[PDB]
Every structure is written in C-alpha cells, then in structure tokens.
Symmetry: C2
Subunit: 112 residues, 2 copies
C-alpha cells in the first residue's frame, strides 16, 4: 500500500541478522518464495517488503497490516506462520534470531 | 510511494529511542510540524513515515528515496539535514541518539 494509506493500521519491522550478501539473497528468495503465496490472501494483510541492508549484514521486512488484531488473529493464529518462522529462523547463515518491532503509523511527509 | 514501487532505490530506517508514549506523540508532532517542509521538494525524496512503537519506547521513520545518490547529495550533503537532526534531538524525552539502518528493497509480497 502507499505508505500513508489510511488502511495501514499496524506495521511490523522484522530484522534478520545474517553473515553476508549470499545469505541475504537466500533469505529474501526463501521469504518471497512462491510457497509464501498464502500470505497474500490472509484477511487484513496489506504488504511485506524485504530489504537487504547496504552492508550485507541484515535483511529487514517492513510489513503493512490493517490492524494488530488482523496480524495476531489471522496470521499469528495460522499454523503456517509457525512453519514460516521455523524455516526462516533456521536458514544457515543467520547470526541470531530475528528481532521484530511492532508499531503504528502516526504521520508522514510526502512530496506534493 | 507504494512499498514495491520500483522507483524506490534506497531506504533509511531511523529509530529514535524515547521515554514513553507522551514523548512519542511530541516527537512525531515536531517532525511533522513544519520543520521539514523543505524536504518535500528535494529531488529523489519519496516519503518519510513516522510510527510509534506499540511498546512506547521508540519512534521509527521509514523513508523512501529514489537512490542512495539522491539521499547523500540532496539530503545528507545539504546543511539543512543537520539543522533538522538538531531540532529533533532538542526535545525533552529523547533517550539517546537516533539509530539508522540503510537498505535496498529486494523482494515483496502484495495482496491478492
Ligand atoms: C523467523 N521468522 C521469519 C520470524 C520470526 O522468527 C519472528 C520472531 N521469532 O520474533 C518474527 O517476529 C517474524 C515476523 O514478525 C514476521 C515474519 C514474516 C512475516 C511475513 C509477512 C508479514 C509479516 O508481518 C511477517 C512477520 O511479521 C517473520 C518472523
């Protein structure tokens, strides 16, 4: 969604510490895989964008949801979220567990 | 811009540690209170979205840029960037200097 779309009620920013660019590419490919297609159809899901840090040491997911309740009761309650968490957090090359920060959009500066 | 617009070549995620929700509100209010009106017309600036962490301890900015070159040359190299930093650090309730992570969008999941 546009970053300041009013439908975006909740945002998760998840950071995965990796040992380098080869692992960053694998992590992204696995996360945006094809078998993660079910996420697209979860009620309340708006977007998940994976980024590689410029220094090769981290992959960051910025994800937009309609609400915290949608994220917790529709994605979190689904058995596939536990499956995906296991898979991503056990890929070889990870230097620690993913760290998530949950947050609400409160203001935005955009060009006119 | 849409999170997966291909024009987004460079992203900065800046985390401001704060002492609770009241400071969260005051910092977003400051950041969107006109101190950075000038940024809207900077070439290559796409957006700056400020969010309050749900735990009350940080304000996070997700900022989209057309390229790292536009960010460094049209933002970082402009003396007004430093004035903006100084304005945001002068607020009571900040608990440390802001932390930045620089990154490139590499994959996305959108709805359907
Ligand atoms: C490893 N998986 C990928 C991982 C793990 O471990 C944690 C965690 N253990 O704290 C986490 O919070 C994740 C998280 O919040 C995720 C995970 C993927 C994921 C995918 C799409 C949207 C979205 O919002 C989201 C997400 O929030 C990946 C998570």
């Amino acid at each position: 969604a546009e970053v300041n779309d009013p439908r975006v009620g909740f945002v998760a920013v998840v950071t995965f510490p990796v040992d380098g660019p080869a692992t960053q590419h694998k992590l992204v490919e696995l996360a945006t895989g094809g078998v993660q297609e079910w996420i697209r159809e979860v009620p309340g899901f708006l977007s998940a964008t994976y980024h590689a840090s410029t220094d090769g040491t981290a992959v960051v997911n910025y994800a937009q949801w309609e609400s915290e309740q949608a994220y917790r009761v529709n994605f979190g309650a689904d058995p596939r979220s536990a499956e995906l968490r296991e898979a991503l957090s056990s890929l070889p090359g990870l230097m620690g567990p993913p760290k998530a920060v949950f947050m609400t959009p409160r203001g935005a500066i955009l060009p006119s």
